[PDB]
């Protein structure tokens, strides 16, 4: 992102009172050989970023210059998804009762190691090996 | 993207009212049909 | 004209070495359309 966008993105997380659309699109492209009309089962799990929340203040400092902020995204990584041959990555309800608060606690870490070398690791609130390999599940149909 | 409202549709239709076919296009398309292409222009996505 | 009656568009590569090559799509008459170009899609 850039001064007309990242510095503005910065500003949002810094101050700008807006709600960044955190569409976590979970596209599940299957195949068509075994069937599967709209194989790609997608659902944008959006997380409206509350202006300067805990998560967005971590993102403020992330985009300020430091790379050590674990952005708390409240349980937003669907760990069980009843995806079919249609275009919807709808998660199983009851598998994840809250299904927005019962998904899986996900974390984010921008790794701007100037050498800004801005990387972006998707961690977990309880990252064991899920900073490089997040293990969710897709209940396929 | 802004789904144009009834009032917004009237505006577009009236803008191009002199040209019959121009207005026709807009008017024929139902309200909340004509959508607004507010494409983002700012960058950061580097040229490669 | 539909090629000459579309909307005057401009381009600006912003290589601010710090080349940090960005790319803003401006307009020939950019008011806020360097970051938000407002066109329309007559949908069907």
Curated annotation (Swiss-Prot), chain C:
Expressed in numerous tissues. In normal brain, expressed exclusively in neurons, not in astrocytes. In Alzheimer disease brains, expressed in about half of the activated astrocytes located around classical senile plaques. In Parkinson disease substantia nigra, not detected in melanin-containing neurons nor in activated astrocytes. Expressed in erythrocytes (at protein level). Expressed in myoblasts (at protein level). Disulfide bonds join 30-34. It is found in: Endoplasmic reticulum membrane; Endoplasmic reticulum-Golgi intermediate compartment membrane; Cell membrane; Cell projection, Lamellipodium membrane. Changing residue 16 to K: Found in Er(a-b+) and Er(a-b-) blood group phenotypes. Piezo comes from the Greek 'piesi' meaning pressure. Belongs to the PIEZO (TC 1.A.75) family. Homotrimer; the homotrimer forms a propeller-shaped Piezo channel with a cation-ion conducting pore. Heterotrimeric interaction may occur between PIEZO1 and PIEZO2. Interacts with PKD2. Interacts with STOML3. Interacts with TMC1, TMC2, PCDH15 and CIB2; the interaction may be part of the MET complex. Interacts with MDFIC (via C-terminus); the interaction prolongs Piezo channel inactivation. Interacts with MDFI (via C-terminus); the interaction prolongs Piezo channel inactivation. Pore-forming subunit of the mechanosensitive non-specific cation Piezo channel required for rapidly adapting mechanically activated (MA) currents and has a key role in sensing touch and tactile pain. Piezo channels are homotrimeric three-blade propeller-shaped structures that utilize a cap-motion and plug-and-latch mechanism to gate their ion-conducting pathways. Generates currents characterized by a linear current-voltage relationship that are sensitive to ruthenium red and gadolinium. Conductance to monovalent alkali ions is highest for K(+), intermediate for Na(+) and lowest for Li(+). It is linked to Dehydrated hereditary stomatocytosis 1 with or without pseudohyperkalemia and/or perinatal edema: An autosomal dominant hemolytic anemia characterized by primary erythrocyte dehydration. DHS erythrocytes exhibit decreased total cation and potassium content that are not accompanied by a proportional net gain of sodium and water. DHS patients typically exhibit mild to moderate compensated hemolytic anemia, with an increased erythrocyte mean corpuscular hemoglobin concentration and a decreased osmotic fragility, both of which reflect cellular dehydration. This is Piezo-type mechanosensitive ion channel component 1. The chain holds residues 2377 to 2425 of 2521 of the full protein.
